Amino acid sequence: EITLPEAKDKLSQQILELFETCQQQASDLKKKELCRAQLQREIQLLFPQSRLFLVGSSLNGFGARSSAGDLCLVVKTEARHILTLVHKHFCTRLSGYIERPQLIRAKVPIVKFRDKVSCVEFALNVNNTVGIRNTFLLRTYAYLENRVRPLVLVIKKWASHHDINDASRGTLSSYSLVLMVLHYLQTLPEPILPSLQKIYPESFSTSVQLHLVHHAPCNVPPYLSKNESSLGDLLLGFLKYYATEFDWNTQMISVREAKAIPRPDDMEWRNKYICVEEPFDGTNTARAVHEKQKFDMIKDQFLKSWQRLKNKRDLNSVLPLRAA
């Protein structure tokens, strides 16, 4: 059902070329799913009722070929001990096909490992079920409009190049960037994206069971927007909007309501510079950005990239096309 929107300008043609040269291919997903099934079978030995779920770029439609696999383990402090036991089991019995399994401290503790057969790393979290939901909510947004997936990919590639795309380093997480892209598409004068949670609350409700969650996108009809902007024009609008137009200090990005919402007066949101509302739980996906240096770096980089793209309507100004 993939459809490529009409390209009038050179920048839009280049964005489509990047989308075609970096679009996650079916083979990559297959290697990831194969590993997920074997890992689930291996853990099921440790926890008979456990279920291993692939979440993130791999299944939300915004993946790239170099994109790593994200695993969510579901079981019927509990998460901490279970993750440590999984890491130990991974070292003791699975050393043959798992390379250098690594336990990394984070808000959501995960285990980083590499599949030797597929040459693909994996990040596994235990019981962070909200990720399963946002994966398929994001997947629905990804295929709702033809320009969503290419635009997300060029912005994701652009951010990673300028080293503003790492939550561990204090910059924007890929989830936050995606949400920032979706919000821009939602709040345009001609709306490109609606609010899936508002329009179809039944489909994305927290009550739906996890195994029933992945079914939300198939049952949702597509959206036709009146926007006539090209991919390059949309990229420039997004770069201009987050560089000069969006007020980080006074506003919070909410994809849940499909509109900018004033920051809550409570103490959790007050300190933070960048406010992005997770649709399922009321938390900040931009919580990693906590340093003024990192915050200033992101803002200056957004404006710099917007400037260079305006002067030269070429992707090379902000993103190098040397590798393709």
Author numbering: 146 to 221, 233 to 480
Report text from the authors:
GLD-2 proteins from different species have various lengths, but share a conserved nucleotidyltransferase (NTase) region composed of a catalytic domain and a central domain. Different from C. elegans GLD-2, mammalian GLD-2 is an intrinsically robust PAP with an extensively positively charged surface. Whereas C. elegans GLD-2 prefers adenosine-rich RNA substrates, mammalian GLD-2 can work on RNA oligos with various sequences.
To understand the structural properties of the NTase region of mammalian GLD-2s, we determined crystal structures of rnGLD-2131-484 and mmGLD-2143-484 at resolution of 2.5 Å, and 2.7 Å with Rfree of 24.3% and 27.1%, respectively. Additionally, the two constructs also contain mutations at catalytic sites (D279A for rnGLD-2131-484 and D213A/D279A double mutations for mmGLD-2143-484), as the yield of wild-type proteins was too low for crystallization experiments. Crystals of rnGLD-2131-484 and mmGLD-2143-484 both have two independent copies in the asymmetric unit. Superposition of the two rodent structures showed a root mean square deviation (rmsd) of 0.52 Å for 322 aligned Cα atoms. Compared to ceGLD-2, mammalian GLD-2s are featured by apparently shortened N- and C-termini, as well as the absence of a ceGLD-2-specific insert in the central domain. The N-terminal portion (residues 1−130), which is not conserved between mammalian GLD-2s and ceGLD-2, did not significantly influence the PAP activity of human GLD-2. The fact that mammalian GLD-2s are intrinsically potent PAPs and stay in a constitutive active state suggests that they may not need GLD-3- or RNP-8-like partners as in C. elegans to stimulate PAP activity.
